[PDB]
Design a protein around this ligand. Structure first.
Ligand code: GTP
Ligand code: ACP
Ligand code: GDP
Ligand code: CA
Ligand code: CA
Ligand code: CA
Ligand code: MG
Ligand code: MG
Ligand code: MG
Lengths: 341, 423, 54, 438
């Protein structure tokens, strides 16, 4: 008989994991502030890691990796990619980005902006922050900085891969689970969050065709759900399209770069967040978001530390969390691809 | 040399107290004549907590025997270990108390209390470091209940900075001598709420049920009931009579067990309770120890919450496995332990087991479910008081109905206080 | 790494390694608090004895 | 040569002190009768070991120590123990009834009655010092005497010896061996009234020592003897520089200079390695790099916490045994690349190293095996604040209901001191987060 607590009522993923644990007849849910728990489904902000692993006779496990915010924050991610030799400034799968405060990189961001100005190359950039829904897509630097007045500005992928029919944009969300042993498990089932509006490179003011967000597409797009239900195209349909349209597979053209990017990011911070010899153990579910350009190159946009799953996949994924992440530590009485390292 | 002064008052107090000294005297190797004939120095290392060392290397119990009738005390002086008591420590009258709290507290008892205090003073004056006092008595009678609480009040006045500890037998209609027992118990409980630091609530109803249901005794006698109390008293005082770190004296016990001054009424439990040569594993001791059927208060712990718990394991056993099982009980049923008192369960171990057992476990719980015991008494009290039934026995001794109304309100207050900490 | 302040003796040696450069109450007051606490005790005891006297 | 006086308060401090002074004698070659054959200057001298020992005309080396307990059972064992001949009766001070795990009882009620006697016995040893550095105070957090009487002693010592330094060796409460539910109360009360008066405190969490004993020594149910022997090893590593020839941490002032740039933040984290069970005949002797790498494993720290999620303000390495500077720097280079070591911007990223060639001494028959080389790391990291958070949380849980508060109020202590002490701990936690977080 195992015990667990719930400290994030707004967690759609672990609300299902909690329901599954109880349905096993071998897990007992306690009060949120009862310390004698085996498993903590902790909160997102100010989770007290310092109070974990001090209960004699209790193997305690938490569903978050302390220090993983370095990877799941706009400015943190940029700083971690530029200042880490394992990733280096020469990182070829991350868009050229800069951190600007309303340290600061105002003079560095403009240096590369003038070089592209004279070069006549695509000089469209995007500025975003970790408190967004609000973003600004402009080709003039003066408008980007006046808008910010912490933020980060990176090159806007001007030539993205466009699905047909539709001539539209999209992004790929990958769910990755890391257990207490730091095994990297990539969920087989991904989702393409597509824009139902044709990509118009002339005007960036109308962000319905540029932002593939599920909320922005259901509020500012008239063709929501026209091509696929909920602007969500799963891997089966996307794979067949790439075979019919480009004579290639999702595994070869895209999935190899995604698996590479996932390893590199999680392997980089491993020494800083691993709980191998720690008095408590950690696991965490991550949400990676990629962009695919017209040349079938994959780019990393950001990593979400508290991601939500797709409706159809909630059941399968949540059951997989219990199997490899929870039951592996507390045994009772594959849908993942193990990224070895 | 933290000495404890023992007092036993009334029929029940002296019959239970006599068995207690018979039990612990055997554990420490002392014979009925006061001579030591043991085989372990652990028996003597703290023998002075309860015994005085006399001439010729004789150990004399630091006990004072009090009663308003000579009957029961003549039985003790003629009992097995009757010769071991200090003759000067027998203080008794001739009239009795007629199961009347007023007689023991205001009339008959008042005439005799000064004599008892003179004996207590003599015992305390020769104490190197007096911890306090422990009183055995019932609350249903007249002497132990009425005079016992009078003694406690006068002892506190003369020794305000000493711990007051009592073993108090609560009345039950199942094992009842007279109908006025709820009256006497209600009046005594208020005295205990104010003037004791630790009170082990021993319910004659629980003792009977255990003897009948568990021990399989069809016609339980008081002797059978006193076997349970005798073994329980030895268990709860193990940490006081043998070398140890946890709850080794009365004050440190009180500091660990009493988070609020008035909520100092404990539920004691004992394990095993066999009807007998089988070995009992550490997991088995722990489960029985926490099972309500082994509780002496007749209160369901699952109806309340544990403020604090003191566990004592006796015998040669895996102290590692003891830690494991104890942590297992708390972690398995953490909902029954208040979360605003972290680590409120303390566990001690004593190598010397009780007579006739390879290993045992004594449970001491401060549970809010003890309110069930006080509610029970309060209902029985009110059933008669609403008709002023049997009051003339008390008004004839000078008492006024107001004192009953106040005792009634004091009791219900205590019940309310327990209820506020159960939510 | 920079090693500095190397001191050696028969029983050992010490040194420093730099990986990177950077980027009371008086006795009177105490006596008052100690005696102030003893006063609150005496007051609490006197009240108890007054209660017992009633 | 400047003398140091050790003060052992309460059961924990007395028993730990008894273990340390036993270890000191084995290290300095002092027999149980106080004789020191290797000492050629009879009846005096200003050697390094004289900072902890005085010398009688008869050649006995008497520890500059004082034992204080409000109950005699613990100090009585020292009066009849193996090293009973070292101490004279004036050094052992005992009462009748202890503080009953009640801070207010040790500080106000009972402490007030014995504070002048202890100070008088301390003045005796001080009068025998040509140049007193200060004091090393051993005590527990949870005990009524260790917490209550210690804070009253630290208050007065600042009055009588204002210019002297004071270091603590404090035992953090752990439920696996604790004896009182109110130990969080006593811990926070004593930390509040002792903070201004302590220049540097080494916290030892019984939980960490307990697990190290079970994990690395194979002790199923460790005892105070097991814990104290391991603790005295750590203490010996920290005080060795005061007792032996050397140039690092040679006086008490240097401890504060090398480890405490921020006065309130004066709780360095101690890590020790290796801890090897003597119950195994052969064990691969660890190297300088291996034991140095172990200094960054939480499993070896005196307080379980994660220094990765904090910042360093200073870090010392105290080596004992076969260690040459070349190997230390080679081990630091490797560790610096693999480990996550972050210093505060206003502090240099470096390590003060100290090496004593005499390898660690183990009590004959104990549980710790002899090793060719050992290290104790003293790192002032903000991560140690995790221990304050744990303590403060339990305090908040009980104090919200005023549980057990009546025991303290009944001894003359006012309820306001509880919240006052808690607000002080709240400020302390805020200081740590400012320094070590962004
Ligand atoms: N490491 C270690 N901890 C100890 C030792 N003795 C007691 N403790 C711890 O100290 C705390 C209790 O404080 P004590 O030192 O025993 O109490 P005290 O200082 O004698 O004060 P009193 O309440 O008057 O007895 C508990 O948390 C124990 O775990 C010891 O020998 N070694
Ligand atoms: N450098 C870039 N090039 C092209 N498109 C970009 C881009 N950066 C962001 N976008 C677009 O912006 C959208 C959302 O951006 P982003 O992921 O940074 O914000 P967000 O954190 O609010 C969404 P989520 O938290 O669900 O991942 C993406 O769907 C992507 O299409
Ligand atoms: N357990 C137990 N209870 C007793 C014994 N004798 C009396 N009682 C209980 O005590 C109450 C009567 O009090 P008693 O001690 O006889 O009156 P007293 O002599 O005036 O103090 C009743 O509730 C009885 O059930 C006994 O030997 N054992
Ligand atoms: Ca008369
Ligand atoms: Ca000399
Ligand atoms: Ca000072
Ligand atoms: Mg986001
Ligand atoms: Mg009777
Ligand atoms: Mg003590």
């Amino acid at each position: 008989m195992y015990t667990f607590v719930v400290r994030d009522e707004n967690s759609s993923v672990y609300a299902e994991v909690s329901r599954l644990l109880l349905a096993t007849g071998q897990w007992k849910r306690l009060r949120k502030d009862n310390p004698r728990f085996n498993l903590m489904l902790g909160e997102r902000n100010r989770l007290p890691f310092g109070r974990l692993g001090h209960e004699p006779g209790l193997v305690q496990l938490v569903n978050y990796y302390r220090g993983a915010d370095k990877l799941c924050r706009k400015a943190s991610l940029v700083k971690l990619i530029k200042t880490s030799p394992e990733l280096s400034e020469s990182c070829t799968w991350f868009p050229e980005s800069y951190v600007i405060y309303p340290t600061d990189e105002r003079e560095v961001f403009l240096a590369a902006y003038n070089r592209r100005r004279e070069g006549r190359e695509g000089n469209v950039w995007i500025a975003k922050s970790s408190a967004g829904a609000g973003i600004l897509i402009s080709s003039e630097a003066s408008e980007l900085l006046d808008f910010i007045d912490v933020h980060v500005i990176q090159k806007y992928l001007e030539k993205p891969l466009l699905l047909e029919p539709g001539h539209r944009k999209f992004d790929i969300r990958s769910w990755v689970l890391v257990d207490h042993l730091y095994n990297i498990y990539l969920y087989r089932e991904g989702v393409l969050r597509t824009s139902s509006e044709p990509y118009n490179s002339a005007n960036f003011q109308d962000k319905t065709c540029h932002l593939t967000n599920h909320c922005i597409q259901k509020e500012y797009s008239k063709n929501y759900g026209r091509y696929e239900e909920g602007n969500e195209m799963f891997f089966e349909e996307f794979n067949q399209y790439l075979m019919d349209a480009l004579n290639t597979t999702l595994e070869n053209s895209i999935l190899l770069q995604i698996k590479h990017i996932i390893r590199s990011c999680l392997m980089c911070i491993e020494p800083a967040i691993s709980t191998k010899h720690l008095h408590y153990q950690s696991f965490q579910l991550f949400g990676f978001d990629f962009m695919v350009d017209e040349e079938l190159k994959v780019w990393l946009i950001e990593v979400n530390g508290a991601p939500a799953c797709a409706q159809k996949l909630y059941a399968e994924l949540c059951q997989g969390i219990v199997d490899v992440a929870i039951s592996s530590v507390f045994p009772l009485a594959s849908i993942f691809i193990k990224l070895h390292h | 040399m933290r000495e404890i002064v023992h007092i036993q008052a009334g029929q029940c107090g002296n019959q239970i107290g006599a068995k207690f000294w018979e039990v612990i005297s055997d554990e420490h190797g002392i014979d009925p004549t006061g001579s030591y004939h043991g085989d372990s120095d652990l028996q003597l290392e703290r023998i002075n907590v309860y015994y005085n060392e006399a001439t010729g290397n004789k150990y004399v119990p630091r006990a004072i025997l009090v009663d308003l009738e000579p009957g029961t005390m003549d039985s003790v002086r003629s009992g097995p270990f009757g010769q071991i008591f200090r003759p000067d420590n027998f203080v008794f009258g001739q009239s009795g108390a007629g199961n009347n709290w007023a007689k023991g507290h205001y009339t008959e008892g008042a005439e005799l209390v000064d004599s008892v205090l003179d004996v207590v003073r003599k015992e305390s004056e020769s104490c190197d470091c007096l911890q306090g006092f422990q009183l055995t008595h019932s609350l249903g009678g007249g002497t132990g209940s009425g005079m016992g609480t009078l003694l406690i009040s006068k002892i506190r006045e003369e020794y305000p900075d000493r711990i007051m500890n009592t073993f108090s037998v609560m009345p039950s209609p199942k094992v009842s001598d007279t109908v006025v027992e709820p009256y006497n118990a209600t009046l005594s409980v208020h005295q205990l709420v104010e003037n004791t630091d630790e009170t082990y609530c021993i319910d004659n109803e629980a003792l009977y049920d255990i003897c009948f249901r568990t021990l399989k005794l069809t016609t339980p006698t008081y002797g059978d009931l006193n076997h349970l109390v005798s073994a329980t008293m030895s268990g709860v005082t193990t940490c006081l009579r043998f070398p140890g770190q946890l709850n080794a004296d009365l004050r440190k016990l009180a500091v660990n067990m009493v988070p609020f001054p008035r909520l100092h009424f404990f539920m004691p439990g004992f394990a095993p309770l066999t009807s007998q040569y089988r070995a009992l594993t550490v997991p088995e001791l722990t489960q029985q120890m926490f099972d309500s059927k082994n509780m002496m208060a007749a209160c369901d712990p699952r109806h309340g919450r544990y403020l604090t718990v003191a566990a004592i394991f006796r015998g040669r056993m895996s102290m590692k496995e003891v830690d494991e099982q104890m942590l297992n009980v708390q972690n398995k049923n953490s909902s029954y332990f208040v979360e605003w008192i972290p680590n409120n369960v303390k566990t001690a171990v004593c190598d010397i087991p009780p007579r006739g057992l390879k290993m045992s476990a004594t449970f001491i719980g401060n549970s809010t479910a003890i309110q069930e015991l006080f509610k029970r008494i309060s209902e029985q009290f009110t059933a008669m008081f609403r008709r002023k039934a049997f009051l003339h026995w008390y008004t004839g001794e000078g008492m006024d109905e107001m004192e009953f109304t106040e005792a009634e309100s004091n009791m219900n207050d205590l019940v309310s206080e327990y209820q506020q900490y159960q939510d | 790494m920079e090693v500095i302040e190397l001191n050696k003796c028969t029983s050992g040696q010490s040194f420093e390694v730099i990986l990177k450069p950077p980027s009371d109450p008086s006795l009177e007051e105490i006596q008052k608090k100690l005696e102030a606490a003893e006063e609150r005790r005496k007051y609490q005891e006197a009240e108890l004895l007054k209660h017992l006297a009633e | 040569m400047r003398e140091c006086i050790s003060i052992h308060v309460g059961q924990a401090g007395v028993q730990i002190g008894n273990a340390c002074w036993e270890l000191y004698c084995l290290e300095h070659g002092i027999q149980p009768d106080g004789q020191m054959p290797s000492d050629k200057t009879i009846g005096g001298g200003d050697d390094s070991f004289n900072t902890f020992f005085s010398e009688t005309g008869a050649g006995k080396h008497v520890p500059r120590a004082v034992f204080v307990d409000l109950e005699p059972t613990v100090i009585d064992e020292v009066r009849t123990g193996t090293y009973r001949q070292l101490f004279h009766p004036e050094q052992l001070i005992t009462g009748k009834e202890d503080a009953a795990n009640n801070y207010a009882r040790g500080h106000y009620t009972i402490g007030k009655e014995i504070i002048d006697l202890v100070l008088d016995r301390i003045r005796k040893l001080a009068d025998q010092c040509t140049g007193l550095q200060g004091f090393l105070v051993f005590h527990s957090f949870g005990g009524g005497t260790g917490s209550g009487f210690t804070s009253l002693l630290m208050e007065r010592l600042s009055v009588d010896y204002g210019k002297k330094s004071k270091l603590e060796f404090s035992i953090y409460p752990a439920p696996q061996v604790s004896t009182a539910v109110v130990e969080p109360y006593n811990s926070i009360l004593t930390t509040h009234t002792t903070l201004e008066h302590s220049d540097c405190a080494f916290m030892v969490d019984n939980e960490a020592i307990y697990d190290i004993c079970r994990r690395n020594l194979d002790i199923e149910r460790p005892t105070y003897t097991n814990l104290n022997r391991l603790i005295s090893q750590i203490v010996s590593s920290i005080t060795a520089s005061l007792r032996f020839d050397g140039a690092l941490n040679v006086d008490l002032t240097e401890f504060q200079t090398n480890l405490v740039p921020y006065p309130r933040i004066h709780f360095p984290l101690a890590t020790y390695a290796p801890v090897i069970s003597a119950e195994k005949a052969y064990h691969e002797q660890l190297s300088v790099a291996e034991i140095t790498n172990a200094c960054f494993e939480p499993a070896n720290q005196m307080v379980k916490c994660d220094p990765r999620h904090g910042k360093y303000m200073a870090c010392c390495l105290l080596y004992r045994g076969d260690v040459v500077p070349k190997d230390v720097n080679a081990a630091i280079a490797t560790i610096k690349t693999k480990r996550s070591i972050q210093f505060v911007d206003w502090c240099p990223t470096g390590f003060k190293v100290g090496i004593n060639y005499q390898p660690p001494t183990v009590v004959p028959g104990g549980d710790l095996a002899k090793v060719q080389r050992a290290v104790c790391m003293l790192s002032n990291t903000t991560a140690i604040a995790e221990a304050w958070a744990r303590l403060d949380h339990k305090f908040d849980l009980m104090y919200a209901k005023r549980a057990f508060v009546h025991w303290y109020v009944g001894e003359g202590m006012e309820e306001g001191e509880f919240s006052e002490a808690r607000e002080d701990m709240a400020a302390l936690e805020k200081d740590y987060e400012e320094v070590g977080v962004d």
